[PDB]
Amino acid sequence: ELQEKLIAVNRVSKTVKGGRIFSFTALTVVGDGNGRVGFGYGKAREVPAAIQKAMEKARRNMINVALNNGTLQHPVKGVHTGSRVFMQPASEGTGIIAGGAMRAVLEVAGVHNVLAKAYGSTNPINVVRATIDGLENMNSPAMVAAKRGKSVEEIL
RNA sequence: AAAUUGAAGAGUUUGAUCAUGGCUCAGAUUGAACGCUGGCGGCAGGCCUAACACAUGCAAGUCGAACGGUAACAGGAAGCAG
Ligand SMILES: [Mg+2]
Numbered sequence: 001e002l003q004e005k006l007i008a009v010n011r012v013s014k015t016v017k018g019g020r021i022f023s024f025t026a027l028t029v030v031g032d033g034n035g036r037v038g039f040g041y042g043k044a045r046e047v048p049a050a051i052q053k054a055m056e057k058a059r060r061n062m063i064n065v066a067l068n069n070g071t072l073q074h075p076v077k078g079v080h081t082g083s084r085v086f087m088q089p090a091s092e093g094t095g096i097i098a099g100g101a102m103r104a105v106l107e108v109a110g111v112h113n114v115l116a117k118a119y120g121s122t123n124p125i126n127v128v129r130a131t132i133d134g135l136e137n138m139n140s141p142a143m144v145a146a147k148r149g150k151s152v153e154e155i156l
Numbered sequence: 157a158a159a160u161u162g163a164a165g166a167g168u169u170u171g172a173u174c175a176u177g178g179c180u181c182a183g184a185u186u187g188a189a190c191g192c193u194g195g196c197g198g199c200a201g202g203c204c205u206a207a208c209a210c211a212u213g214c215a216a217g218u219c220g221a222a223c224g225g226u227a228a229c230a231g232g233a234a235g236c237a238g
Contacts, residue, residue, distance in 0.1 A: 013172040020171055082175060091161050099164045115163050121175070122165070 003108050004030035004055060007101045008124040009047055027101075027125050028054040030062070031108030037135065038062030039105065039128050063132065066140035070112040073141075078134025082121030085130040090115045101127045109135060 006028045014021040024047045031037035040058025044050035066073050072089035079085070085102065090113045096106050098116035101124040106114055118127050145152040 011172090015171050022172090086163085088163080090163095094161065097162080097164065100166085103164070117163055118165080123174075126174085 002030055002032060002059070004028060004058065005104050005108060006051055006054070007104045007128060009050070012043075024050040026050040026054040027128065028058050029105050029108050029128060030055065030058040031105075031110060032062075033108070033110035035065045035067050035110060036062045037065060037105060037109035037132060039132060041125060063136050065109055065135045066138060066143065067110060068140065070110065072111060072114055073138050076134045076138045078130040078137070079120075080126050080130035080133055082123060083118065083126035083130040084120040085116070085118050085127060085134055087114055087116040087131070087134060089113065099127070100124070102131050104128075105131045105135075 006026055008027045010025050010027075011022055012025055014023070023043060023045050025041065025043045026047065027039065027041050028051065029037065029039045038058045038061055040054040040056065040061075042050045042053025042055070042057055044053055068089070069092075071092070072087060075086070075088040077084070077086050087098070087102075087106075090097070092113055094113045094115065096103050096111065096114050096116075098106050098114055099118045099122065101122075102116050102118055105128050106116065116131075118130075121127070139147075141152050141155060145155055148155065
């Protein structure tokens with residue numbers, strides 16, 4: 001029912017004639033726990049405002065994910081520029097074995113049993129982007145059946 | 157019947173950013189040592205260095221059913237003296 005959680009809040013600076021201008025960026029992630037997950041990156045002069053902006057962004061532009069019984073559909077890799085991510089379905093009771101950002105994104109998405117690792121850069125925004133991309137691309141057996149022109153029973 | 161149920165990151169370069177890239181940390185372990193402290197038990201372990209030098213005691217004897225035998229001991233026998 002739209003569970004949301006803020007991964008990282010980071011202070012960034014701009015320089016002007018006067019001096020430095022600080023502002024805050026908030027990376028949040030929302031999801032319905034049934035497949036839908038979406039991340040948002042808001043910027044404002046103060047943290048709460050930034051978070052609100054991020055939340056609105058995340059709530060819009062969500063994406064559907066094919067989940068098989070609260071777990072992944074197959075082992076999937078994902079990249080986004082520096083962040084290359086691996087995530088593998090695991091037996092019921094394994095829990096989310098996943099990094100920071102990754103854990104958040106998976107949890108809001110609704111995966112209950114995963115084995116993840118973040119290779120490459122572990123920059124939260126890029127890592128979240130990578131995970132969402134991987135989750136999105138991951139197809140289900142009904143999808144493969146549709147593509148190949150067979151029944152799901154012939155493929156298994 | 158069961159005996160692979162298995163994979164987490166963080167700090168640190170920049171006014172800020174992403175990347176590269178090192179350093180550091182979170183875990184487990186030990187024939188450990190040192191500091192402070194210290195009640196009991198169970199089960200293990202205990203010269204990693206000088207294969208350096210070694211006082212002293214012990215760590216390989218046994219068989220008389222292989223053999224001459226009796227140093228003893230322990231006993232009887234024969235000779236005896238009270
Ligand atoms: Mg030695």
